[PDB]
Amino acid sequence: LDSKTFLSEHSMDMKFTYCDDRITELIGYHPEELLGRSAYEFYHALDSENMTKSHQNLCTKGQVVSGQYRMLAKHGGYVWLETQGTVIYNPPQCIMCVNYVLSE
Amino acid sequence: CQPTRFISRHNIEGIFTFVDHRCVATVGYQPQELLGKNIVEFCHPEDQQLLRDSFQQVVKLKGQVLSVMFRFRSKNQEWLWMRTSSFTFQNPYSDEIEYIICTNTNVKNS
Ligand SMILES: N#Cc1cc(F)cc(Oc2ccc(S(=O)(=O)C(F)F)c3c2CC(F)(F)[C@H]3O)c1
């Protein structure tokens, strides 16, 4: 559970701005190679419109649970995940994602 | 029969900054579903790195044509084979950052 859970942070455009190193033991990516890239680059084609929809809920509500989606792994194949996302607004400044890996 | 095709403009990073409305019939998205997003987000995982290196190269090619073939995810979530021919433009009265003009055609891979 805990060793399958990692955080990421995203700009409002969905780009990674930070990722736990734990994503390396789970999906193969190095956090540094993620930064600057949209989450979009990584979803399975069959999940993409759904994530766009969860995204819209996140922006209108401020927090949301993604429900189940696939991330293309660093060395081929897809890993299932469920994410809770939370918008950090200040005085939108970023999105915090708590990401739980459902599958190997 | 006309090939189906639309023009787009991107910044050097790949982000769509202009989309010709012929895109609806070509890939099924409205212009605004494309504007502001990187073209690499609509690209097949096996073709993403080619497309990123294509954008990197078109800017070193002195405004000449670079062409690339890749699979683009239509609004039906089908993979369409795309040929994108691109070249840079930079107004020589200025020293503004060049941008990238693309023409995007649905082609047969065969
Ligand atoms: N594939 C993948 C992947 C793997 C991750 F560890 C995080 C991620 O990004 C999100 C994964 C889930 C969500 S979400 O739960 O907030 C909504 F999009 F589903 C969101 C994002 C980016 C966001 F902009 F913050 C937000 O849209 C995508």
Side-chain angles (χ1 to χ4, degrees), chain A:
Chain A
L1 279 181
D2 188 287
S3 81
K4 307 190 276 163
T5 304
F6 64 100
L7 317 187
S8 55
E9 181 194 74
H10 297 257
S11 33
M12 286 326 288
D13 58 11
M14 305 187 182
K15 278 165 177 207
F16 286 87
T17 52
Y18 163 93
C19 189
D20 288 350
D21 293 329
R22 190 108 84 189
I23 197 178
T24 309
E25 264 288 292
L26 298 170
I27 317 198
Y29 297 96
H30 287 287
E32 52 269 52
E33 71 188 303
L34 290 179
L35 308 193
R37 301 164 72 188
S38 172
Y40 255 108
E41 298 189 16
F42 304 90
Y43 303 140
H44 193 286
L46 289 182
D47 292 326
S48 312
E49 306 293 285
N50 279 340
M51 303 302 291
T52 285
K53 286 190 206 57
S54 279
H55 193 93
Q56 298 162 349
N57 290 301
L58 180 58
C59 285
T60 71
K61 290 149 217 321
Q63 183 179 87
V64 75
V65 181
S66 79
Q68 309 190 327
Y69 69 92
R70 269 155 298 183
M71 185 180 193
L72 167 62
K74 170 93 171 183
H75 308 289
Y78 285 89
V79 171
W80 282 95
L81 299 201
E82 216 159 64
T83 285
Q84 187 189 290
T86 308
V87 179
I88 307 305
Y89 309 90
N90 256 42
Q93 313 317 310
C94 72
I95 309 170
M96 289 295 310
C97 287
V98 186
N99 313 288
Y100 180 69
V101 175
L102 295 173
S103 78
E104 357 300 292

Side-chain angles (χ1 to χ4, degrees), chain A residues 15 36-38 40-41 45-49 52 72 78, chain B residues 13 15 29 37-38 40-41 45 48 52 73 75 77 79:
Chain A
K15 278 165 177 207
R37 301 164 72 188
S38 172
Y40 255 108
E41 298 189 16
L46 289 182
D47 292 326
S48 312
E49 306 293 285
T52 285
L72 167 62
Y78 285 89
Chain B
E13 186 204 321
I15 297 306
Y29 297 97
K37 302 179 191 166
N38 195 306
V40 180
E41 299 164 24
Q48 284 182 349
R52 290 189 282 265
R73 183 192 76 252
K75 204 196 176 30
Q77 294 186 140
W79 288 119

Side-chain angles (χ1 to χ4, degrees), chain B residues 6 15 20 29 41 65 67 69-70 75 82 106 109-110:
Chain B
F6 73 95
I15 297 306
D20 139 46
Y29 297 97
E41 299 164 24
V65 185
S67 140
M69 254 184 93
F70 68 97
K75 204 196 176 30
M82 299 298 296
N106 196 181
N109 173 30
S110 78

